[model samples]
Target: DVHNLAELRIAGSTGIDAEGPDSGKHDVDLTTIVYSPPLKDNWRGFAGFGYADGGIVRDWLAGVEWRSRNIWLEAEYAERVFNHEHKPGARLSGWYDFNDNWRIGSQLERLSHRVPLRAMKNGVTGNSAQAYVRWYQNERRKYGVSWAFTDFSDSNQRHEVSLEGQERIWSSPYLIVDFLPSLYYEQNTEHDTPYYNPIKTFDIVPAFEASHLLWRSYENSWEQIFSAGVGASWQKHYGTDVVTQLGYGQRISWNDVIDAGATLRWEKRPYDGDREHNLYVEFDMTFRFR
Candidate 1:
């Protein structure tokens, strides 16, 4: 494979409310760009610049990234002022793939929350690492274990882990199915604040799903599926509890250019030792305007 490759990318985001006590959750606006130059070999480097504002949390980006056929490494430094927050208010993340179907990756960053329910004050930090193996992708997603460490500014820390994956058991020209099972463990280092942090718990989830093709034209098609699962959540000090979920979704594809989907789900689970119910409606779409 002898070739040259150069690329460019741009991204931006904004929030609804402009400011308030929840300024961190509201007054958010960011934009960035990256450019990579062509190279004769497999390895290449890229750099970019970006800015964030809404007159709330702001940061400037300057970074270099090196990438090859199976590896990527990034190093970025923030050029932020307005209070000399130049304390490297940045992030670190990268991954490497081993030829025999194993991969490992990790990310380190200053913690910030956007979900109103899991709001947090500034100065919290979190990092996560994951490693997994795959026999074949078309067989199913990779199976692996991961850990996330959270350290709050107030000296409280948390640990979370999970071992998860699904296996493809059934397939045909018109339908396919998989066996889904997952495990989770979470622990808190201190009492809860304004967040829904579970003190300590271990959860085992088992389920399966089946998808059937509804219609197809050439490479364009529509599909729908449903899945159900029950979870056994064992709290450290509290007795074991049960959780369940039911989900159904529809997806559509237009060759390789457009993809869209919609889904509805219902779940009942324990939140901080108390059972809770919730319904979710979701929609997503992706378009390649080439």
Candidate 2:
């Protein structure tokens, strides 16, 4: 029974961007987590605490899970506060491993929270539900399909469906690559929130990686691991709007995974009658254990 595990993690992210006539923001976040693992039995449970910038957003969440043979069930509740408004919601999900080659699942989520922080007492409510299934062939290939509903009280809420696939490549003995591609469509209803109440869109995403695990070495009585990769994703905002992101991650000695690194990001929005550009640099340090 002790083999049934639990885990906790904490992380933080902060960024400053020049926006709206040279406007910018500074933010900090911290999180706490707990999980109850799978066992010979059929039930599990979990809970977590998350807080950001001193009450900017305080939240609590709890959930339960049930597994029987090839079927699974789960439900969760979450509540949040922003400025002076609050939003509390719940979600339920079910999954069935149709067979050794496939698994299908669906979920429903409902949430409501206040926006316009210093301007209005009213809030925005959102409901999202989705279903998906995947097929696997050995370890080198996978294909999947998904459909989702994302609607809001004021913004355009609609349905989206997509097909996805992945394949592994042996480009070199020291490097391996993974390729993934997907497409999406959306309709904006003109909800006055910004983008589209109902909009139409689609996208393609490609991801790649290369790793040789440079001979594992010993450092200060500790073992070290290192690898690197690069990839990108292009997504839609509205009416064929596309956004792309590219980045990489490095793993170091177990004694010091908090190695230093820097990244640069560039974005261009020219089509759809809008023109904007973004440049960013990131620095991160993470340290944790249990």
Candidate 3:
């Protein structure tokens, strides 16, 4: 009888990078939500529609989900266009919550021509399955491990594994900081494959981020947020890289159910080779009406 609401989201981001005009692109997405009433046997469901466009690529998305307190199931389909070529994919996923602090999930996906074909006799397609487990130390700290196996249409297979951890270091009324660390390993079994034959690499990345509440109205009508972050990573094939980000956001609330926000961000990536830079501006609006 409860836990039912409609959600609408609209967001867009534009950025420019080192590739000049080719790297300058903007993406926009719209999603609409529909909620359903509870069914017999403790079942509940919802569905959504999504549309997105990002220059050379576009996506038409649909998904359905049913879940209980401890179990969740979902299926999603996407029709994506890449440089005027049609690509289609579907994903099925589910998760079980052992308790509030521990959970595990698995996903299986199939995509056709998701990866571009270059100098290959057949188009490139991907089929993959992955499983992951997560543990929450508290509301602010988490750790995760995941493994994935992938097969391409062309006789090639790859394996990947990752570990991630995040912790909140400090928090005050106006300032907060977090640290995140991740490790990744990937291997390709077939060397003769066209695109999958590239050199495999392992990486370790650690990042630190801090945010400050710059301003807030006395009546809580509006607020401003400022954030900065830096990350350093060491990779096997790719040399070491350093990345930094600075961002500012302004949010305002109205009518007790609607909110709007705008954000501006700048990022710098300095690799072993020539450096790259990116800038983005984004806007979003949300409405919560029951």
Candidate 4:
């Protein structure tokens, strides 16, 4: 058995007319590339790189992986060099399966002198750890819950707990329906940070998504998906607020040689003690090389 994988992930964001300290944090784009080759029957090795455009800039990484017999493990190290920082990074992660119904995993990552488009970014550029347990039967019928914590160089600390899953409930020849559940609680040590560091927040959302294969040929295929959700979110002092989202995405596969997709999403959610509207788009693509 063999698998050839090359991946490209491109995403961008902008906070238009945002004059708050959180402004530049949304002005970020990241593009990543990775090619994986098998090392043995159960081991793999890969070369990967990604660009963050400005600030922290680019990083180069190589890693190893092994997945078989109820266990999966991976480790990677990166050299992130840019205008004024040497943000080296490392990550290690692994998972174990218990019987055929449950799986557990943990991950650890660290970065030195790392920065995002802005120092006010609430995520990344720090040391982080996470652990998760899952209950599942198949790829489309899985559920998981995780706990994560991060120590940021800005003297900020964050802890988050969440459960997220997409469980298939219906399927047809060209259409599939999925039920999505998301619940999360986040707490931060410092609310005075430039970013929107909530002292504590809790949110729960249940959604449904449907996808249809629009067209297919010997060498090409297209699919589209749409999802909507309604829920509630509560922030410290902000109380509880309404939450809603609508998303649309389209994907194209070119004979498994190259595949690409895009998603456009709109949401109204509570942030910084206010309900704000957001609309953004994301792009993803993959390549397979012989």
Candidate 5:
């Protein structure tokens, strides 16, 4: 029933002592919606499709959905073009609602990007399962626990389990909390190659996020998302433990149509164990559809 929609997202960050290539990562995204039915049930008969172009990732995808009062399932096929590489994959997921406070789901995905290398050859496949339980205290407040397990590949198996949930503070336009603690394990596998070795590596990570709105002027608002997170990773074979990132975000909204924000990033491992207080700052912006 509705058509012609678009969105743009831009982000940038700076830090004193950043990680490797994984660090100082930033991107911009532009997504265009070609078509969609007025309702999910209606589109369920066929499938949904969208095309997007952006730095974070560029992709075209087709998806199908199945849903009921307490259950839902989705399948999607997407081809991504990024870092001068073409990656295509398909994934399927299903979720069942146990009741007003419980739910569970599982997903499987296979993705490869090569003319000659497929999942049967040099590629990646992932399988994951999760469970969620929620407690609704009132209308705008709820708390929940989510657990998930992920397997990267057959030869190179990695395990990841995470617990996450969010809660509303009050009836005010501000105050929300989200927390996630995740553990990751990767086996001895090819670190850099189409065919890598499969080894066992274990890692632990914990993160908590708190956000509060500071100001709102009819059509505008400002909020801050603060997070302190860390991770200790082991490659099973031999690898240095890498620390993730801890940062805070400040976002300002204008007319609920535009959002501009900034982020300050930090790492536990200092330049020399607190050698130089190295940090980075990034600017971001988002524009909504008209």
Candidate 6:
């Protein structure tokens, strides 16, 4: 409910990189922040910045986001500034929510190869645009569908469609559980970009999660929560992938002048073949002031 609050956030990530040309890599330093203001009830805005320096690549990022009861918009920019040529990129995204339960959105994104470990090569530039609609059933379950088109500097065009949904399994005052599923279809024409091998494929993902509310103040001044989830993705050409995650978060207030919170999460995903297995752990702390 950031309607009348200013927030600042600090976060970091460290993980193993086991994919692509930069396989078998290790890095543990990444940082980010957010700053927001307490403005009108119907309008909100924020700015974010991030930096990462791992042996394989170095990355820097900056972004701005704005929101209102009916509209949401964002602009993001990033650059790869180390160990290779500098590659700059930018993205824009916007959405219109007719109500709490329904919304339509669009996004445009671009990236360059100086960004290592990406799907495309470092020297080549990649661009993507998408449109999507999302809705909830009676403000309960969620559903989404989207279409996307992508192109790369070397001349590769790709199209994709995605569908996602969530179902509540059960809930209690202290605990809640849900099942989430998603499907994606991708198609591309043969091109010489070396960006993607250009293949047509389908992927289906299903996941289940359980979350618990550990503690809460009657006045909603403070609270703590924990959650865990397991998921699997089946790809027509890439085989099945599995992941498990655990998360914890807490929030507290400081005399109505400031609010603060912290979060910790760990995730494990394993892959077969040349694909790299991933184990990511991160922590973040945030602050908001009246």
| All candidates: TM-score | 0.68, 0.68, 0.69, 0.84, 0.56, 0.70
Give me the candidate number with maximum lDDT: 4
Report lDDT per candidate.
Answer: 0.61, 0.56, 0.65, 0.75, 0.54, 0.62
- Per-residue alpha-carbon lDDT of candidate 1 for residues 18-49, written as tens digits (9 for 90 to 100): 22222233333344444444443444445555
Model 4 CA deviation exceeding 4 Å by range: 1-26, 53-56, 112-117, 120-125, 137-141, 217-220
Candidate achieving higher TM-score, 5 or 6: 6
Between prediction 2 and prediction 6, which has the larger lDDT?
6
Per-residue lDDT of model 5, residues 68-148, tens digit only? 768888787877655577867677778777766666666666453211122333335555555455565655554555444
Rank by lDDT, descending? 4, 3, 6, 1, 2, 5
Candidate 3, run of 10 with poorest lDDT: 112-121
Report how far off residue 207 is in candidate 3 (Å): 2.4
**lDDT tens digits, residues 182-208, model 2?**
555555565454422334555554444
Supply candidate 1's per-residue lDDT for 195. Answer: 53
Best by TM-score, which number?
4
Sort the candidates on TM-score, descending order. Answer: 4, 6, 3, 1, 2, 5
lDDT, candidate 3, at 98: 95
lDDT of 3 by residue, 40-70 (tens): 4444444545554443445566666777778
Tell me each candidate's RMSD, in Å, in order.
Answer: 6.2, 6.2, 5.0, 3.6, 7.1, 4.8
Compared with the true structure, model 2 gives a TM-score of 0.68
Candidate with the larger lDDT of 4 and 5: 4
**lDDT score of residue 150 within candidate 3:** 78
Better of 3 and 5 by TM-score: 3
Which lDDT tens digits does candidate 6 get at residues 162-239? 999878888888777777676777776664433444256565556665666656666446556566666654444566
> Measured by TM-score, how close is model 5 to the native structure?
0.56
RMSD over all Cα atoms, model 1: 6.2
Error at 255, model 6, angstroms: 8.0
- Model 5 residue 17 distance off true place after TM-score fit, in angstroms: 8.2
